[PDB]
Design an enzyme around this catalytic site. Structure first.
Site, PDB file in Angstrom:
ATOM      1  N   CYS A  90    -139.487  71.583   4.390  1.00 34.23           N
ATOM      2  CA  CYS A  90    -138.907  70.330   3.924  1.00 34.23           C
ATOM      3  C   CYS A  90    -139.938  69.214   4.066  1.00 34.23           C
ATOM      4  CB  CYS A  90    -137.610  70.004   4.668  1.00 34.23           C
ATOM      5  SG  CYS A  90    -137.704  70.101   6.459  1.00 34.23           S
ATOM      6  N   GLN A  91    -139.768  68.328   5.044  1.00 31.66           N
ATOM      7  CA  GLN A  91    -140.668  67.191   5.217  1.00 31.66           C
ATOM      8  C   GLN A  91    -141.188  67.138   6.652  1.00 31.66           C
ATOM      9  OE1 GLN A  91    -137.896  64.118   3.128  1.00 31.66           O
ATOM     10  NE2 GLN A  91    -140.005  63.469   2.681  1.00 31.66           N
TER      11      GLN A  91
END
Ligand SMILES: CC(C)(C)C(=O)CSc1ncc2ccc3ccccc3c2n1
Length: 149
Positions: A90-91
């Site tokens: 994801c991040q």
């Protein structure tokens, strides 16, 4: 630069910057990518190299990730069945993707939620906290113990 953390020899955890290192992914024999964001692109999609799945989730205190668990488990098993690696990312804080990874360790390797977290935290030292996701993993652990999921 890029750290594609191998949680298992075929299951990799990373953030947005990790997911953009194409050479390392090919060297690690990765053929499957799970993007656990709404807004990030599917990196390298037009090159036709990987099978993609997007779990469109945000890193909030209200996001439901449990709904995506079973879908992500099947994608991982598909990579597992044909001898290919899967990258889930994801991040920066990897909050979303680490939740899915821990859940898989609970479901498929029978680790407890606590032992699964310590396993992932030991290999991926930077993990941002999300009390909402912790609560869902706790409810998921009870459902596993009660043979409800
Ligand atoms: C759910 C997600 C992976 C996104 C995180 O929230 C990681 S951050 C964090 N920080 C302190 C903790 C202290 C006990 C604990 C017991 C079980 C599971 C997690 C923790 C824990 N997790």
């Amino acid at each position: 630069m890029a750290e594609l953390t191998p949680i298992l020899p075929f299951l990799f955890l990373g953030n947005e910057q990790d997911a953009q290192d194409l050479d390392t992914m090919q060297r690690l024999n990765i053929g499957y990518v799970i993007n656990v964001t709404t807004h990030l692109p599917l990196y390298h999609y037009e090159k036709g190299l990987f099978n993609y799945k997007r779990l469109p989730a945000t890193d909030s205190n209200k996001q439901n990730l449990r709904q995506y668990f079973e879908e992500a488990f099947e994608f991982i098993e598909e990579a597992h069945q044909c001898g290919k690696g899967l990258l889930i990312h994801c991040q920066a804080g990897v909050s979303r993707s680490a939740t899915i990874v821990i859940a898989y360790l609970m479901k498929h390797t029978r680790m407890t939620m606590t032992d699964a977290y310590k396993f992932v935290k030991g290999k991926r030292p930077i993990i941002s906290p999300n009390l909402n996701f912790m609560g869902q993993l706790l409810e998921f652990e009870e459902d596993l113990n009660n043979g409800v999921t």
